[PDB]
Design an enzyme around this catalytic site. Structure first.
Site, mmCIF file in Angstrom:
data_model
loop_
_atom_site.group_PDB
_atom_site.id
_atom_site.type_symbol
_atom_site.label_atom_id
_atom_site.label_comp_id
_atom_site.label_asym_id
_atom_site.label_seq_id
_atom_site.Cartn_x
_atom_site.Cartn_y
_atom_site.Cartn_z
ATOM 1 N N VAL A 26 -28.811 13.031 15.688
ATOM 2 C CA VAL A 26 -29.196 13.750 14.497
ATOM 3 C C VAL A 26 -28.343 14.984 14.319
ATOM 4 O O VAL A 26 -28.061 15.355 13.193
ATOM 5 C CB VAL A 26 -30.719 14.076 14.412
ATOM 6 N N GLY A 27 -27.912 15.596 15.420
ATOM 7 C CA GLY A 27 -27.205 16.872 15.329
ATOM 8 C C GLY A 27 -26.839 17.586 16.618
ATOM 9 O O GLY A 27 -27.629 17.671 17.566
ATOM 10 N N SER A 28 -25.620 18.112 16.634
ATOM 11 C CA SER A 28 -25.129 18.956 17.717
ATOM 12 C C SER A 28 -24.033 19.884 17.174
ATOM 13 O O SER A 28 -23.483 20.711 17.900
ATOM 14 C CB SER A 28 -24.614 18.100 18.886
ATOM 15 N N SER A 30 -27.404 18.534 22.339
ATOM 16 C CA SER A 30 -27.425 17.457 21.372
ATOM 17 C C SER A 30 -28.857 17.005 21.142
ATOM 18 O O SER A 30 -29.676 17.086 22.062
ATOM 19 C CB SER A 30 -26.577 16.295 21.889
ATOM 20 N N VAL A 31 -29.139 16.519 19.927
ATOM 21 C CA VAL A 31 -30.471 16.083 19.539
ATOM 22 C C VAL A 31 -30.364 14.686 18.993
ATOM 23 O O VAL A 31 -29.422 14.379 18.279
ATOM 24 C CB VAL A 31 -31.134 17.041 18.512
ATOM 25 N N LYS A 46 -33.908 16.476 22.781
ATOM 26 C CA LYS A 46 -32.810 17.419 22.882
ATOM 27 C C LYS A 46 -32.261 17.432 24.285
ATOM 28 O O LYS A 46 -32.953 17.846 25.217
ATOM 29 C CB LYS A 46 -33.260 18.848 22.524
ATOM 30 N N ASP A 157 -36.336 26.236 16.540
ATOM 31 C CA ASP A 157 -35.113 27.000 16.644
ATOM 32 C C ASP A 157 -33.991 26.131 17.209
ATOM 33 O O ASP A 157 -33.929 25.883 18.426
ATOM 34 C CB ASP A 157 -35.334 28.252 17.490
HETATM 35 C C1 LIG Z 1 -39.525 30.499 18.859
HETATM 36 C C2 LIG Z 1 -39.727 28.973 18.960
HETATM 37 C C3 LIG Z 1 -39.836 28.548 17.512
HETATM 38 C C4 LIG Z 1 -41.033 28.630 19.743
HETATM 39 C C5 LIG Z 1 -38.542 28.229 19.641
HETATM 40 C C6 LIG Z 1 -38.267 26.890 19.595
HETATM 41 C C7 LIG Z 1 -37.128 26.764 20.297
HETATM 42 N N1 LIG Z 1 -36.476 25.627 20.609
HETATM 43 C C8 LIG Z 1 -36.409 24.531 19.842
HETATM 44 O O1 LIG Z 1 -36.891 24.476 18.698
HETATM 45 N N2 LIG Z 1 -35.770 23.509 20.393
HETATM 46 C C9 LIG Z 1 -35.547 22.340 19.741
HETATM 47 C C10 LIG Z 1 -34.867 22.324 18.513
HETATM 48 C C11 LIG Z 1 -34.599 21.120 17.855
HETATM 49 C C12 LIG Z 1 -35.024 19.903 18.398
HETATM 50 C C13 LIG Z 1 -35.700 19.926 19.607
HETATM 51 C C14 LIG Z 1 -36.134 18.720 20.156
HETATM 52 C C15 LIG Z 1 -36.813 18.720 21.346
HETATM 53 C C16 LIG Z 1 -37.100 19.926 22.007
HETATM 54 C C17 LIG Z 1 -36.654 21.131 21.502
HETATM 55 C C18 LIG Z 1 -35.953 21.134 20.283
HETATM 56 N N3 LIG Z 1 -36.786 27.977 20.767
HETATM 57 C C19 LIG Z 1 -35.697 28.277 21.536
HETATM 58 C C20 LIG Z 1 -35.891 29.128 22.627
HETATM 59 C C21 LIG Z 1 -34.827 29.505 23.451
HETATM 60 C C22 LIG Z 1 -33.528 29.068 23.159
HETATM 61 C C23 LIG Z 1 -33.303 28.232 22.071
HETATM 62 N N4 LIG Z 1 -32.058 27.818 21.865
HETATM 63 C C24 LIG Z 1 -34.378 27.838 21.241
HETATM 64 N N5 LIG Z 1 -37.599 28.848 20.357
#
Ligand SMILES: CC(C)(C)c1cc(NC(=O)Nc2cccc3ccccc23)n(-c2cccc(N)c2)n1
Ligand SMILES: CCCCCCCCO[C@@H]1O[C@H](CO)[C@@H](O)[C@H](O)[C@H]1O
Length: 330
Positions: A26-28, A30-31, A46, A157
């Site tokens: 879907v996107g990188s 990687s997801v 992810k 995020d």
């Molecule tokens: C503040 C909040 C909204 C709870 C949050 C969420 C995320 N991480 C993600 O959303 N990760 C993911 C983004 C997109 C697809 C994903 C699929 C599976 C698991 C995590 C995903 N966060 C995150 C935290 C630390 C580092 C990064 N890069 C992202 N932070």
């Protein structure tokens, strides 16, 4: 320990339990979208990019795993599973995170007032939750919102449409210890854009961004200048040609009067003066959605680890522990 299978998906290797089928980019990190055979649902998986290559990477890996493990709310991304192809700590060098797939992001989508009401409602709802645990999102923008065809919305995020356009002016300014309120500024930016179809502040850089921002909300007043510690920030700001706060009703003409009123309360320069997520939820704009007994807060979240300086193998091993100790939700 489930049986794994490997695959190449655009240069990256993927080694995932057999329960996950039909992997498709879907996107990188990687997801990939996949079908979870255990539950019947499409998921996003992810694969963390180089999770333990440095101390920064390793701490960031631990940070996201810890955090996602704690998120248990309808309008915030949660964890369905976390796994690694590693049979021990020595072997541990890959982390995969699993979540409920959603159709698209809000970047991919001008909407009806009933739609913005529901969409912004749910954002505020997840944010109330995130803020009660002392987490600031910091990077709210349409592509950090997953929305399905039912219009159900989750906050996530990616860490990858310019971040800066949604960013609170104080952050454009490397302000020390800014607060939760930066996210409400972001939500007002988003809400405006759904109402109008136009980026509220399409700034070409950080200076342009603030110039566009001041042009709508006007230059800082006496009460706000009292709170500016930085002398160079202060001189510069007072040396600027002063603008009065525009009338938002003239700026957002034809918009629900209640929508306009709420924007006025979000899009305030002084961050102590912004409406909170808890308060906003109770605003009259969300009358058809608001339910005080179904707008929950988070269990307390301890992020004291943020202040620790540890070795790569110590972050790695902590992460390992969090993988092992993971309890799938019902
Ligand atoms: C503040 C909040 C909204 C709870 C949050 C969420 C995320 N991480 C993600 O959303 N990760 C993911 C983004 C997109 C697809 C994903 C699929 C599976 C698991 C995590 C995903 N966060 C995150 C935290 C630390 C580092 C990064 N890069 C992202 N932070
Ligand atoms: C033109 C630039 C004006 C920027 C002023 C933004 C005001 C931000 O608001 C400020 O946020 C700080 C960080 O949370 C708080 O400590 C202050 O109390 C609050 O006034």
């Amino acid at each position: 320990r489930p049986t794994f299978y490997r695959q190449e998906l655009n240069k990256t290797i993927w080694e995932v339990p057999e329960r996950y089928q039909n992997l498709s980019p879907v996107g990188s990190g990687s997801v990939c979208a996949a079908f979870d055979t255990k539950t019947g649902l499409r998921v996003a998986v992810k694969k963390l990019s180089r999770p333990f290559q440095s101390i920064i990477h390793a701490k960031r890996t631990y940070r996201e795993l810890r955090l996602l493990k704690h998120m248990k709310h309808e309008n915030v991304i949660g964890l369905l599973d976390v796994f690694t192809p590693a049979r021990s700590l020595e072997e541990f060098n890959d982390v995969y995170l699993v979540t409920h797939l959603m159709g698209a992001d809000l970047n991919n989508i001008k909407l009806t007032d009933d739609h913005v009401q529901f969409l912004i409602y749910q954002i505020l709802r997840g944010l109330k939750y995130i803020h009660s645990a002392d987490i600031i999102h910091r990077d709210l923008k349409p592509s950090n919102l997953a929305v399905n065809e039912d219009c159900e919305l989750k906050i996530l995020d990616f860490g990858l449409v310019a971040t800066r356009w949604y960013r609170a002016p104080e952050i454009m300014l490397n302000w020390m210890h800014y607060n939760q309120t930066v996210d409400i500024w972001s939500v007002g930016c988003i809400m405006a854009e759904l109402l109008t179809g136009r980026t509220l502040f399409p700034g070409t850089d950080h200076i342009d961004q603030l110039k566009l921002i001041l042009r709508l909300v006007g230059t800082p007043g006496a009460e706000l200048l009292k709170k500016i510690s930085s002398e160079s920030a202060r001189n510069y700001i007072q040396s600027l040609t002063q603008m009065p706060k525009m009338n938002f009703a003239n700026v957002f003409i034809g918009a629900n009067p209640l929508a306009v009123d709420l924007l006025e309360k979000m899009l305030v320069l002084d961050s102590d003066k912004r409406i909170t997520a808890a308060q906003a939820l109770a605003h009259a704009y969300f009358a058809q959605y608001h339910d005080p007994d179904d707008e929950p807060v988070a269990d307390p979240y301890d992020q004291s680890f943020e202040s620790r300086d540890l070795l790569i193998d110590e972050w790695k091993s902590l992460t390992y522990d969090e993988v092992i100790s993971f309890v799938p939700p019902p």
